[PDB]
Amino acid sequence: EIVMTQSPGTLSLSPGERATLSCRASQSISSSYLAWFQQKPGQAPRLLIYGASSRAPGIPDRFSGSGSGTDFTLTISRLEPEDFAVYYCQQYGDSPLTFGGGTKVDIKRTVAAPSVFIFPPSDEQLKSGTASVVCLLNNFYPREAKVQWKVDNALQSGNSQESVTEQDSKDSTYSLSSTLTLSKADYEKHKVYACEVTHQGLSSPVTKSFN
Amino acid sequence: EIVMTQSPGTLSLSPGERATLSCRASQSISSSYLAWFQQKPGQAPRLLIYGASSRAPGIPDRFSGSGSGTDFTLTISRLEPEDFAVYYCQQYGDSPLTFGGGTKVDIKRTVAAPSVFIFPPSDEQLKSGTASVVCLLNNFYPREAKVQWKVDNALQSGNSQESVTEQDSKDSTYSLSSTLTLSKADYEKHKVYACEVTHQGLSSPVTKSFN
Amino acid sequence: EIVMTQSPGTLSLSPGERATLSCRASQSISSSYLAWFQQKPGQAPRLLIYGASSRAPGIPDRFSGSGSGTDFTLTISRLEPEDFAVYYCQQYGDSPLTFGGGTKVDIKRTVAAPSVFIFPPSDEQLKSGTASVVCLLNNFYPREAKVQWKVDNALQSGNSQESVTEQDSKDSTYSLSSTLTLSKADYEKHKVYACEVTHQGLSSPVTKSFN
Amino acid sequence: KIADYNYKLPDDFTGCVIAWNSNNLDSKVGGNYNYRYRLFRKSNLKPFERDISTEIYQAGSKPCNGVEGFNCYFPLQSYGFQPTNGVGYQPYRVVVL
Amino acid sequence: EVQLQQWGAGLLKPSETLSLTCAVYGESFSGYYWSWIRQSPGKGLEWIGQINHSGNTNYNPSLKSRVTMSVDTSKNQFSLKLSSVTAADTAVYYCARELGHDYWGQGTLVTVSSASTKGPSVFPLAPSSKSTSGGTAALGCLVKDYFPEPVTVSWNSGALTSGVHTFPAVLQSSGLYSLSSVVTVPSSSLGTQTYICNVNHKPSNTKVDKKVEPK
Amino acid sequence: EVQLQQWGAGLLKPSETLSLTCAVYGESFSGYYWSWIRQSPGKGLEWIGQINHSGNTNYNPSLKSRVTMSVDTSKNQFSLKLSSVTAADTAVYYCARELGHDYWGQGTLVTVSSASTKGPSVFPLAPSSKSTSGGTAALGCLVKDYFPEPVTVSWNSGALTSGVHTFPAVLQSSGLYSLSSVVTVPSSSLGTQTYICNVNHKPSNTKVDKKVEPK
Amino acid sequence: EVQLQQWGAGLLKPSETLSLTCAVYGESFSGYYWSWIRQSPGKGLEWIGQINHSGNTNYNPSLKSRVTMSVDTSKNQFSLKLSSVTAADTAVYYCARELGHDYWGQGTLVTVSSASTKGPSVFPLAPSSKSTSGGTAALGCLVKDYFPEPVTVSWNSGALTSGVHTFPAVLQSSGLYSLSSVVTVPSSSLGTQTYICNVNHKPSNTKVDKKVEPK
């Protein structure tokens, strides 16, 4: 099982630029039998380059491949808006076909600042016996962000989970929702609660607090 | 296989009172190993009292148990709106684990009178060859009231069954429907049919006839 | 194994008329043990005549039976609307019970001319990878209707199949639909497709075509 | 329960089993709450094996280190013998050879 | 904390074999006994049996001859098989831990019958002449001869939702269901407002509407 | 009066074994012969065999090799087993008393196939321009490639019920069924009125709508 | 050109068997190898095995003990069986030709879970007073406790399609799913307009409407 490892999964670059993707195999690939696949959301993967050098029929000329031994790379000369997808390696020079991890490409733009619009737990859920509070974020280009919950001025972990939306078609931003669950007795016992937002673009450590 | 007998299943009492439920067994229970279960509709039973005296963790302290030998009782000091359910016994000092019969506690309201409506059968129904006559009661405090059909001034039995509805949320009333089924010649025999209602709240022996 | 051969499977005649159904056996039936069964759509057969002459209890006297040796006949003097069903012979005087093929009776009406329609395949089905062309006939009484396909003025056999609906409740007419299936290359290679129908109701063999 | 948690005979067993009613000797007008049997055990016994340990039965989440309480119960429970009990609930005296 | 999730077939024909499975999440699977309990409205709660990880089973003496239990330790599951099922086995089955007292499953309904899915029928009902004179009349519709449980009834496409009584479905000798749905209206309401009773049966996908005409 | 109720497996695979059961109510069970009769859309009514209370059987010589019957007098039931099942055994089976002439079962349909449950695909049918010029036109939708037979088709959410024809399903060489639904409308009504057909397939639980537009 | 059409069941209880089928159109079915590829959100693309018309099978050594493959040459189909399925087998399955490089199937989603179908629930929300003072607020509806994955959420009966965020569903400890749908509005609009959230869960056939009002 020749395990394949790729470049960092997420890389951001502005359109109309060049892109380089790396691919490494745990062992040598016979006769440079390496292939590159492209997958768009909702569709099956499509082959782009076979033999690590050639180009499949119907493929534009902006895709190129070069490598040997245990090191290969894919190059995109110009990134059209449709060239943003996930790219996979495949070795077909050995017995079981093996695919790579996959590399994602995003759209670069200016750095924005997240807006937080928290909602307090409703009465109806309290009647059902469960409590949900949601630290919310909206409109921020750098997907990397951190939010930390503070209950009784102490760290809370292992009881909250986060959901992030996909990149927008034109705004190219993200929206995150973090939901933390606590016991009714625990939520009544303590008076101060907060979620603190740390983000590289937004320097100030905004600790949104409520009672 | 200890047979567990329990207080009459139906008992009605206003909120904010003391409720006592009795339980007994054919044989003595070793080490006073008796448990009391509360079951709300549509959910699995929940434990209240274990050992006939102790209280389960996280249980409100308005529940008490007392008894030994072959006689046990459960007491609710004050009834809350969410304290109405079905209550079960369980003995576990013997290998065949057995439960009780079940006692249902209700909310009581001032006595009211049944109302009777008569629906003559349709000839479209008689086209198949069978006819049905319905005697109905609405808004009467006791769960059941006696209803009897009269065909050609003759009593009928073994040929009908009655259906009742759960008590209303805030009206706390009851509705009862009795349906009769007969062959075509048997229905066509008499023009005059009646249904009579025997009920304690309404002193009149109401009998309902249609032509 | 006595093979019972019955009269033509379809006989059509107007209501309130004399109906005669014939039956023949390969061997002479002992003691004239022959029976006639009536089956209405969607339910089990019902016995009408036993012994080839006698009538079962509860059967209207418009059914009569007459025959002997190896030739038998069932007669309905005048037809009620309910009497339109399928009729079966049944010999029970030999080791295995054998039934006849069945005779279906229909309602006669004035001759009608079918209306021919043709539908080209949709592009979605072409993307799926198969093309289906449907040619249908509406509201014609005589069930005998021949439909054929001209693909580039050539006859196609074995690649199309047709379905016929039951007799209408009030129109007493028929609808037929013949579908022809082809692959992608077979459909896209040719330009003109046509379906033409010969039906005794209308003299003109209507030929409907599309590009 | 007797064949699993109390006394188990092997399948390849040779011998006799002799039982007789003993209502006369062990009844008492009041209950004869003196005999006892093992009710709770976490596994079946092996043939001709004897267990006399108390060892409070866990049957729950809390360990219950030696103390009885909720979901933690004493495995040995006493027979209730009275002379008025019907046959099948009154003592029998058993010898296995 | 222990979460018990159970699944199994809810409709069986007589002489079939009932199979149910329960899966345990959150706590140690070994070191405990896992129990099956049925509940029937006819009699009440009854204990069926229990099994531990090693395969040692305790059975109720009444059902000892037709109860089998299995354990799958790899994926933390235990299953019940009840053979030669009969119409008296219709109940609600729960999987619990040890004697109970702390954790229970959600419980699945099992019904045993020898009937096939088919649509119901609506039998018309007309208010009697006295009801119009009285000032208070009743409108009812009777639904008959359907096997599956979720039959639904409505008034005027849900226009008359106040004072609606829907008596629960009952068994019959043939194994079919019959019920009635009733509502109360004043004599002034009679005729001036149309009352149309609708019934919907999704398992057979049958919708029947009946107009109400005073006698 | 005698009432017969039968049940069994409605779907099978080739080389499997068919099993059916029939139960009798209302009269005596012993002192009688109980028969199985098979009806097929290709050949016609056929007699399979019969059995009595003590276990004596009569078989049709054609099917003597694969047919078996059993009787349970305790609960008044008799059962049929038919091994080496092939696709030629798809038919409606009835349990009857003696030669017949008195009482028949309700009849159970048995289908033999080696296909899995699939959801239907819907394709619109486009009227031609000359069809519009003719003064009347027909709009249909074609349902294709579903294995289990029961499929319900309606138009305009059931509002349009005039001039609609739903042809019977036909088995294809791939083992999946297909049918079509057609409705007839005036040509002038086209373009200014919207027409949609909705189809529900319950075994795969797929309900899909489809609008038909002129070309 | 080759067109590949696949089908099979999507919901499976643990310890069941997975069966999928794929059908080939357009080119020859013989003289080729047909492969199954699995894609998980937590692992990546994985090759399961392949089979040819002669009946020869190549298996991935990881799954060789649980994978079976069958070919039906008469109707040009090939099928995959994966026994003793587990919650780690939830993934998208494709049928392809040989190593790929030319043609792939559309893909079938398979979810393996021990939870039963349940209806979604909506929790009300209230904007904070500080949000109103700031100038912008957010109004959102929270949907919880529905097992089958596909659910649709809309606002203003679908009229409001600007700024609507529907975060992907997340799986909880109990085995159910939840999500939130939010919209951003000015604080000036508060106190003068009423909003609405609409949820449609197809597998449970549930439609829920909630009236969202300020605070």
Numbering used by the authors:
A (entry chain F), B (entry chain H), C (entry chain D): 1 to 211
D (entry chain A): 400 to 496
E (entry chain I), F (entry chain E), G (entry chain G): 1 to 215
List sentences from the manuscript.
Here, we report the isolation and analysis of two anti-RBD neutralizing antibodies BA7208 and BA7125 from mice engineered to produce human antibodies. By combining BA7208 and BA7125 through the knobs-into-holes technology, we generated a biparatopic antibody BA7208/7125 that was able to neutralize all tested circulating SARS-CoV-2 variants.
To gain insight of the structural basis for their broad-spectrum properties and the neutralizing mechanism of BA7208/7125, we determined the complex structure of a stabilized pre-fusion trimeric Delta Spike with BA7125-Fab and BA7208-Fab using cryo-EM. The resolution of the overall structure was 3.08 Å, in which all three RBDs of the Spike were in the “up” conformation. Consistent with the BLI results, BA7208 and BA7125 bound different regions on RBD. BA7208 and BA7125 did not compete with each other, indicating their distinct epitopes.
